[model samples]
Target: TSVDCTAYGPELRALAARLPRTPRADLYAFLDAAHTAAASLPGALATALDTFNAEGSEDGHLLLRGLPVEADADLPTTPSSTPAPEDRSLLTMEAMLGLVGRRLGLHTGYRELRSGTVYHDVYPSPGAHHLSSETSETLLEFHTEMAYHRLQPNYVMLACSRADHERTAATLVASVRKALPLLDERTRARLLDRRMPCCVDVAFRGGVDDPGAIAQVKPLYGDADDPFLGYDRELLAPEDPADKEAVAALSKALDEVTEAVYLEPGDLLIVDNFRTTHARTPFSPRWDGKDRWLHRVYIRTDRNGQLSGGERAGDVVAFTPRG
Candidate 1:
C-alpha cells in the first residue's frame, strides 16, 4: 500500500513557502529545516528518512509522503521540455527534496543529462523518438539515467506535479535484489565482470547521428552475499551470444518482479539507480497547458566516496562519473 500524507499538510506548506529561490543558498536552509522538523513529520516518512540517513546503499530510492499540490493555474508550463526560470520558486516540492537530500548527502551532478541543472516541465510526448526526452505515447525503456557517466547519481527523485489525464502511465521499477535470485548461476557468473558496450541518451548528444559508441558496464558487482546491479535495457550493448543470453535472463527476471506505480500530484518516487532499473509505460498527451509534469533531481550520498570536500545541500557541482 502507498503511504498517505494528508497529516503533514501545514508543515509541508510552510516548508515549501520558506524555500529559497536560488539553488545553493536556499537549498541549504531548506535542508536544515527539514532535518529539524523531520521528527515531527509522519511516523512512516520519518522512519524512511532515518533509514536513508543511516545506511543507504548504492541503490538509492525513497518515497516522501504528505507533500502539497496546487491547481493547474498555480503551476508553470513550458512548450519545450526544459523547466523555465519562474517555475523554480514552487518550493512545496523542492523543500521536501532539499531536506531529504541533505539527510543523505548533497547530491552530485552527472556529466550527461541535466548535470548541474534542475529538471522541470517534464511531460510525455505523443510520438517521441529519443528515450531520454519526454514523450506522451512512447514507452520509455528500463535504463539508468546516466550509468555511462563517471559520477551517476546514487538516487533519482521524481515528484509528480501533474499526472496523465487518464492516469494510464505507470512508472515501472525492477529491483536487482528481487530479480537477481531468478537468474541462473552460470548467467550471473558470466555477467559479473563482463563490461559490455553501451550507448548514451540524446541529452549527452555524442554527435549528430549519435554514432553509437561502446562503454563497458558490469551488469552485477559488489559482494556476492548482496551484489549490486547496474542494468540498462536500452543503453547496454552485448555482442557475444553468451552475453546476450545472460542479459535476456536478467530481463525476464526483472519483468517477473517489476512494480508499476501510478504517481499522483505531490507523490514523490525515489529510485535507487544502482539497485534497480526504472521505466515508464505509454501515456497520452494533449499538448494543452495541462499535461503530465514531473519535477526531477539527482542526489548523492557519502556511500562509495561520492562526496569530495565539504559539500552542502543545493550546491551544484560539475559532472563527473566513475571512470
Candidate 2:
C-alpha cells in the first residue's frame, strides 16, 4: 500500500515555497527548513520513516505513493544532464526528497557523478553507459549504487515526475534480507566480509578509457545476521575462481527473489542502498517530453556509517574505492 500524503503534501509544499528559489543556496538553510517541514508528516508516514531509520526492513525499500509532484505538463522535458535549472522553484519531488531525506539522514552529492549537486534528474539519454541510470533501452543490471566507494550512501531516493508511455520501466530491488536466507551457510561464509575487485562508472575513473576495474569492494559486508550487499552484475570483476563462484551464487539468489516496483508520477522509492541492490528493466523511450522522468537524491546516515565533521548536505564526496 502507498503512504498517502494527501494531508502532508500541502503543508510540505507551503514550507518548500519558503526556501530560496535556487537549489544551490546554502545547504544548512535548506535542511533547516526541510527538518521543520518534516515534523508535520502524517503519523503513518512518520512511523514508516522511524522504522526505516532505526532498523531497515526486509522489503529493502519503502515506496511512498501519492506524494506531491508536478504534473507532467509543468515539468521541463526530460533532462539530458543531471542538474536542473539553478533558478527554478522547488519541485514537489525535490521537496519530498529534502524533507523525507532529512528525516533519515543527510542528503549527499557525488562530486564525480552528477555535477556534485545533491539533486539529480534521471532521464533517458542517447548512448548512455549501460551501468548508468541514464540508460533506457538496456537493462540497467542490479547494482549497489556506488558500492565501490568508502562513503557510499545509506539510501537512494527516486521521485517520479513522469512515467514512460507503457510504464514498463519497472524499478526492481533484491533485498539481502530476502535473498540471504536462500543461500546456504557455506555460500554465505564464502561471500561474507570478503572484498573483491570492482569497477566504477566512467566519470569516477577520470573519464579515461579501456582501463580495467582498478578499485575493490566487498560483495557482502557488515553484520552477519543482516548483512549488506555490493554488486554490479557488470561492474564487479572477481579474480579468484572461489570469489567468482561465490558471486555467481549471489547473483542467482538475488535474481530468484527480486521484486519489481512500477513507478508512476508522484511515486517515491526509497532504496536502502546498503541492504539491497536495485535494477531497472529496459524500455524504449520515444524522446517525448515525458519519458519516465525521475528526480533522484542520495542520503547518508550516521546509523550505518561515518558522519565526518564539517560535512554538509550539499558537499560532494569523491569516490574512494574500498577493497
Candidate 3:
C-alpha cells in the first residue's frame, strides 16, 4: 500500500517489549494496557496512526514498514495451526498489532472462525481451496473481509514476519475510492445501493460441504458522491442481468487501479476493509522450516455502525447476515 519501516527504533521496540512473552493469557487485560501505551509512541508513528484513524485515506491502505521483528534464528518456525501454540512467545508483529490496533480500534473475533480468537496466523497451508488464503500456487481473489456479515471488520491488519521463499507473494489491494470515478453514471447507479446475493467463506458456512453460504450485500452504499463498497470479485452474485453487468464494470475498474504491496519482515499493512478489496498472488512455498508467514487480525472501528461503544478488544461476535 505504501513505502513501509525497519526496527521501529528503540522507543517503539521498547514499547512493544513491555508486552509479555505470553500476552494472550488475559487477552483484554493485555490489550487495554497496550492501548494506553500506544499513545506514547514516537512522533512520526503516533501522528501517522492519529491521522489515518481520524481521516480515512483515498488508497484504503496504510503500510508501516520498519517496525520491529526478531532476527531470523530468534523467530519461531512458520506456524500451521489456527490457535497457534499457546506455549510460544509473543513476536514483535503481535506487539505492533496490539498497540497500533488498539489506538485505531477494537480487536474482533468471528465465532464460527478460528474459535473467535483475536489474532490469526496467516500461513501457507496444504490442500487449500482456490479461493482460500492457504493456496500457494493460485491467485487468491479479492473480497471485502466478512462482506456478507453484519459485523464486518473496519480494518484488516497483516504484519509480516517472513516473506515467501522468493519474495514473490505480493498482497494486492483494489481501492474503491480510487476506482469509483472510473465508472459511468449508468453503471454507478446500477451498483449503488443495489442488493446482491453474497456467500460466506468456507469456515463461516459450517462444515457441511461449505454449508449455509448465502447472504445479502449491497455493492455500494452511503454518501451519494463518494460511497463505500462491499465487493467480492468471486462471491457477490447478482441475479439480474443489469446488476451483473454493473458488478462486472466495478470488478474491472477495481482491478485497473489495484496496487501490489510486497510485504517483508517488520512490515505492517493496515487495510480499510470497507473501502477496498484485497488479494494475494501465488508464491512457491518450499515447506522446509520457513514458508511464507504473517500475523493477521480484524479490527472494528466505531465508523461502520457495528459499535455501540464500551466494547473491548477481545470481543467475539456472532454472524448476522447483512442485507
Query: Judged by lDDT, which candidate is best?
Result: 3
lDDT of 2 at 90: 67
Judged by whole-model lDDT over C-alpha atoms, candidate 2 comes out at: 0.82
Q: Model 2: per-residue lDDT, tens digit, 234-303?
A: 8898888888888999999999999999999888999999888999999999986667788889988885
Q: How far out, in Å, is residue 173 in model 2?
A: 0.3
> Quick one: ranking by TM-score, best first?
3, 2, 1
Measured with C-alpha atoms, the lDDT of residue 278 in candidate 2 is 94
Q: In model 2, what is the error at residue 284, expressed in angstroms?
A: 1.2
Model 1 residue 24 distance off true place after TM-score fit, in angstroms: 7.5
TM-score of 1: 0.85
Best by TM-score: 3
Candidate 3 — what's its lDDT? 0.85
Off by over 4 Å in 2: 206-213
Model 3, position 103, has a per-residue lDDT of 85
In order of listing, the candidates' clash counts read 11, 0, 4
RMSD for each model, in Å, please?
A: 3.6, 2.4, 2.3
lDDT of 1 by residue, 1-323 (tens): 24567787776677555555654435456566655654455566667766765554333356665578776577767345443453356445656666555555564444344544544446665557757548667778887767766556678888877788899989888888778788889989988867777765666644433233445577887777566677788778888999999999999988888888888888888887767889899887877878887777777776555677777645565433233
The TM-score values for the models, in the order shown, are 0.85, 0.93, 0.95
